[PDB]
Design a protein around this ligand. Sequence first.
Ligand SMILES: N[C@@H](Cc1c[nH]c[nH+]1)C(=O)O
Ligand SMILES: N[C@@H](Cc1c[nH]c[nH+]1)C(=O)O
Ligand SMILES: [Co+2]
Ligand SMILES: [Co+2]
Lengths: 700, 699
Amino acid sequence: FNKILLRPLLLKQKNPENLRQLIKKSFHRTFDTFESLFSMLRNDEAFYNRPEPLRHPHIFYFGHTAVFFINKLILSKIIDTRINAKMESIFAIGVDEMSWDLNDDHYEWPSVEETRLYRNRVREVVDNLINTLPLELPITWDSPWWIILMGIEHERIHIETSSVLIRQTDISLVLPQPEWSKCNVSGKAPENELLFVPGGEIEIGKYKSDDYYGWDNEYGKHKTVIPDFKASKYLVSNGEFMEFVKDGGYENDLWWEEEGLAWRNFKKAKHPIFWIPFKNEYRYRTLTEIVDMPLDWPVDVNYHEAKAFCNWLSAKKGKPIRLPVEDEWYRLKEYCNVPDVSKWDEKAPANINLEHYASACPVTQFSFGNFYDVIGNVWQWTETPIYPFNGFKIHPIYDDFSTPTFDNRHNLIKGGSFISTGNEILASSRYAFRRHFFQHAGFRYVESSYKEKINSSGYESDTQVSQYCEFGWGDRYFGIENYPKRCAKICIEVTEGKPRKKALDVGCAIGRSTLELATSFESVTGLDFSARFIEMAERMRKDGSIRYTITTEGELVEYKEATLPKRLAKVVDRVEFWQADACNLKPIFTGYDLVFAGNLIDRLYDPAKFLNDIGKRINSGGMLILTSPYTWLEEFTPKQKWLGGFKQDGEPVKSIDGLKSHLKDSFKLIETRDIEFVIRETARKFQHSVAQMSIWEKIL
Amino acid sequence: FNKILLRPLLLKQKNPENLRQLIKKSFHRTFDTFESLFSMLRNDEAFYNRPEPLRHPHIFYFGHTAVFFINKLILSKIIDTRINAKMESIFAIGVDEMSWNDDHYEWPSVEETRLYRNRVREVVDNLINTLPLELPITWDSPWWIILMGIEHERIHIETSSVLIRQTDISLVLPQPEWSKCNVSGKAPENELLFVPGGEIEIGKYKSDDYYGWDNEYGKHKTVIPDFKASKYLVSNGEFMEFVKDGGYENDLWWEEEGLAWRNFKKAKHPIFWIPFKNEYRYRTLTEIVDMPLDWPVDVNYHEAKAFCNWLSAKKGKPIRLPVEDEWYRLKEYCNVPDVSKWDEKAPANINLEHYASACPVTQFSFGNFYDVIGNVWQWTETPIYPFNGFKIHPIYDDFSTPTFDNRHNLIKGGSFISTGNEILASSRYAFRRHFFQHAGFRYVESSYKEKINSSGYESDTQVSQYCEFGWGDRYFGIENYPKRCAKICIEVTEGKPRKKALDVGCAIGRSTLELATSFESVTGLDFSARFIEMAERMRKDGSIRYTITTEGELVEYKEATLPKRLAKVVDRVEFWQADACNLKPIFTGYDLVFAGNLIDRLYDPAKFLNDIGKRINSGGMLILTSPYTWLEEFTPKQKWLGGFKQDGEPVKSIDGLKSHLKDSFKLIETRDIEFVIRETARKFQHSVAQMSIWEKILE
Ligand SMILES: N[C@@H](Cc1c[nH]c[nH+]1)C(=O)O
Ligand SMILES: N[C@@H](Cc1c[nH]c[nH+]1)C(=O)O
Ligand SMILES: [Co+2]
Ligand SMILES: [Co+2]
């Protein structure tokens, strides 16, 4: 009962008032646990120590978890009065961004007693909210209870991450507390071995209507197939890692990847971060105690050290050994039939959720099938940088919880440690760290031929690429249907009963019309002057999805993911994208039954030359289709080379009349059509234009 | 005889096929007359003489009136086949801009041009026979283009006869078809006769009978007082006193424009006076004869104006040239009959129905006056201008708009050779003040000071867009934005004081004038001096004119006239240039301050919200609209009100407004308001502004 309340709450309870008391007790117990964590600091002066250079002092996180409640309840408009706006700014945002290179004090921290009194006032506000706020089932993302739970599961994250910081604090500044006792059993390190793990269909990703609270990075759908592989029986113990250290592992550059080698030489690292050099031997550092080395406990390493061990072990065993991917750990868990939190008894079946120890335990204590410590004890590093599943959607109250970590620099860790609580002990939760950062994290190694495919990280934010991604793959504005798609549908319309072997899409941009044309034309080529546009158009064709940000106001953005629909995914093999200047096309681009050029002719420096060159490249009786708003400007075209918008012989020359004039000898005008299109700039500013489509047929 | 066919055709005929034959005869007769004019050139070589340095040689206008038909029939898609595109470009456009192009280069041969005109004649003759005729004739009818080509040629019949009259006497040949008047005597003494004032109302309705150019349509009303006009036109003999008194030698009589022209041409005598020993001889179209002292004199405006200034000094009275309204008043007072009421012979020396020259000023009487119409054109002091309701014809959109430059003064009455549309009362012709025509002048005595507005059309891209934004049409069905915002301001101020209001970022002031309908005093402020000038111009003059882009350099001529309900509240409005971030302290004590689409265009919007609060009365309303397009082009990121993250949470713009306006204002409501800004005929900005309505704390 003392630590069982730290398990994540099942939210689909039969009674709403029974769920109220569970959330009330889940909040106070989490608040109590975090405040009890700092009782391991010797005195109030130790709150202002910075144990990890890449993080704040303890005092910041002491108030940060309470301030986080107020800032989210104010932003969600659940409450309207702040408790202390001064403190709520100073404890606002933590620090990531640690390239292992640095804040220099210059912070005026409140006193420890000041922060204690503030935290107590946050507790009554939330307690009053839990008492007075209506509870409507089921709990949705819009429900105010989601924000309260967000503060709870965020505080539980800081329970673990501050315990690492305490474990990194000078031993003279910490005080052992019986509420945070260590494991007292340790012995000989067992001999690890590689055991068989079967492959199969991996299917992870949380649906929107699943039961527990979850962060945004948990939701989506991800499927892949991994082969049969081998995983180590135990986590890598201190003793197993001791062989690597005694074989000059930190001295031999052959084992260290280029990033880890750079980190190792900067830190001048010679041994794991919680190994204390003692004469010719090594001692071990728990949260608040220095004890003799427990050789059968797991080792604590960042990614670089664990990877260096795997490269060293590969040379000894003569076999390719590496860290697992996230999918391989999920396969291992399912193969071992690890039970979810909802099926646990009075005690957790792993060293987890603070239900057994406030430190690691022997790697031989908790078994799961043929394996040990599949969950619990310490985190297990992976080689998969955290990434959003297909269907990922941010929560509006914390839109940047995970999206800044989608940078191919935060490697996923699985299993959870002895102190991982709440959301962290769910199977669907996904936590990641910079590959140099230290936690209660070790590693299990695998032997696998599986080569995981990593995609481009982050979201594209170049304003020009963002707009045209939205223009071809975004939503409809003012009820105007998709312009690249509508144009392509008209191309398919006016070519019924006509040849459809080859088609060319000049000015294809992000290639929506190109893929739409490929549904009826056997070979379609997309050309655009922008190498950036072609890169995104090819990425959508290969990967089947693109990610980008569109502006709402100023620097604020919305995160968008455009996924290729099933009907367009079939025809990706009929599409090619190339960078090309429409006024000097390579001779290889010829023999087309249809050439489409959308919003292009009024953007070319010599549109007459393009019309003269593209005619020689269309088959007899082929179709040339042009759309343009006729925005003639000296920015793109010299006035002498405009097709319209000027007076000659005292009569106005309209652009459509100039098009007949340049296409008189070789083309015939079928029809003209007016087509609206909308290009989004911000959430409130758009371009709304009426382009003219002109449909031409080649003279036989 | 057959000269009646040159009268303008009444288009509301009983039968459509009777109008066809009238137009058929009107075309051939006009085509015949223009070609008969150049028989007064002695040989083909004279076609390449340039009599007037500000115009082309005769050969150009010889083929121009035929090329005009083809170019208009091609542009209006009435025909699709050109006769000679090479010549249709050489004879395409004449030249104006003749302030005191195509030099001495190779023109087509005279025989080449003859054969071309003949092929043009059968194309038009074919069209007149085969085109369907639907009554009534409209601007969209193909018969309007044919009438346009006919009436354009009649203009060149008169203007080319001037050029012939300016041609060296050795290169012209008198023709019996163009005989002069042979009667002349002593000049009578002119006198000023009474002309009554009253209500002047001119302007052609769209559904009126005759063919007319664009500058004839619209409505113009004014009131002029009683005045006096000279009984006769100024004769050579009357003008001779001015010339013998050193008129061309005395600078006191010449206005600045005319003095500069006279020194440039070294003018010592009228243009058609030939100095012979100590006397002067006279030049008709093709003959040099003794001075007909009782014929009217041929002068430009500068010479006519200098005569009036000289006569003002002699008589001790303010004598000037009439304004166009005054000539129309003299015409109505003398009961001059319209062309539709004429008998077999015109009641004036006009329409080539009497002479190919001027005649004595004592010949044609109209009431107590002579030559109210006919004989020679009569100069005015009115630069030509479009009436309210002026609309161009798409086939010839620049026929008159380039003359709306305050430099082309109107001339009225017509001359002996004015034909067709020129002899209608509603027709309006104008020339640059230095230009020479068969034009004389009557003088007047009047204290009436005519008001002249700003000429031309505004073409600066920004001023055009915001003129269209405040005073143009609706696009995508979106209601006028400055007007809608002002109406909402009135809405949310019901039961509140309405003494003084301020419109910051007023642009062309549509919202400012709209606010004046319920606010006793409205002040409009804007950073752009160009905008404030146009806003004040709309307030004083009641109308503004600007061009909006269709494609490239092509434009659309727009006229925004102040509506009747806003003209009443004009006296309550002030327009001043001002920087909203550093306002002068005199702008204060407002019951409403409205700022449309401004805060995200200011360098320091927070400072503006702090300054403007001090200047609103207790319980007054502050209303802001903005799309929140925050950009470092206008505002440093540090001074944004929204669109940024702080303390790890997003700050939306409306929440930043509440934060800055917390101490002094209360948010009443917010509304989304769409607006459209036109860039071209096909490109627009379509945005959704948020209107935030704030009320100041009572204490
Ligand atoms: N991206 C942040 C999310 C976070 C905020 N607080 C705790 N965790 C991180 O990895 O640390
Ligand atoms: N604005 C021109 C109109 C015109 C063309 N041709 C004859 N007239 C002019 O006054 O001369
Ligand atoms: Co945090
Ligand atoms: Co002309």
